[PDB]
Amino acid sequence: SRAEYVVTKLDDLINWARRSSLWPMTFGLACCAVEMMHMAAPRYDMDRFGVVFRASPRQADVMIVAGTLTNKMAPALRKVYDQMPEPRYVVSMGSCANGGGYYHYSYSVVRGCDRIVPVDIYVPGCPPTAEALLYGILQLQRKIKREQKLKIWYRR
């Protein structure tokens, strides 16, 4: 009955909850939002995995940056992220969000959403196949599987 073992199992439970219930946010900027939809569609049923689009940041757990991020939109994106409550994850979807993409050298594009918010997972493509975005969601699920927070608290 070691407290370290108990804490590891408790953390497994915490992560299982926060993982099997990932409510993203209805935040789609450009084409990549269409593949987001298609990943919400019958062929790839999101809710099947526990994923549910909630429109309020105060209820969401992750935000998928699904398209190009202009300088006129970055403040709103950072504000929304700030308004999401911890634990909060972020997913960059496409090449526009990762590094500006096809509009990298433009005067009105931030060359990466990773400049305005911190990104956990990068999904490449223009657009990323909905299958790929799902692969990224599950990659995030596993990353959450590997948080080990309470073990750290107990080791402190």
Partner: protein, 178 residues
Amino acid sequence: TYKYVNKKEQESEVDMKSATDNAARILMWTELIRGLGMTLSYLFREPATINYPFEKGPLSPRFRGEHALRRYPSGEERCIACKLCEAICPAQAITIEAEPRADGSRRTTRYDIDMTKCIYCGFCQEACPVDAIVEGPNFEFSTETHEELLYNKEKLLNNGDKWEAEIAANIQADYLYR
């Protein structure tokens, strides 16, 4: 030619039967019961949901996903540093630096692709006159870091040495249509 969608309405003729039918429609909610019936029918149909990641969505040989540099069956590299791929890459994602290999051949030292700039358009593999750069089928190559998505010559060469069994067959299938 043209047609009307909501002008079909003609002059008004009304009977007791028509009035009673419209009344039943308005009082018993006929038209809504039909939507209920449709949604019911859909409940007893087979869902189009595939069981990912076990069974996957279809694709075609022409699918253009992850990039890879190939080789001749002898193991020699196909790239000759002609630079059409970076000359046309409309995202300016490719970067090349060539130099005479010790044996004298024309080969590259740098071949980098910012896969955060690639729009996955395919122009590079239709420009390459030696079928060296291709856009493979792999799309499950997401990362936890931006740096991982900045491929160099070694990464693309390893991908080519990893997918050749598939890239080559898809080419053999699609190369008559080009």
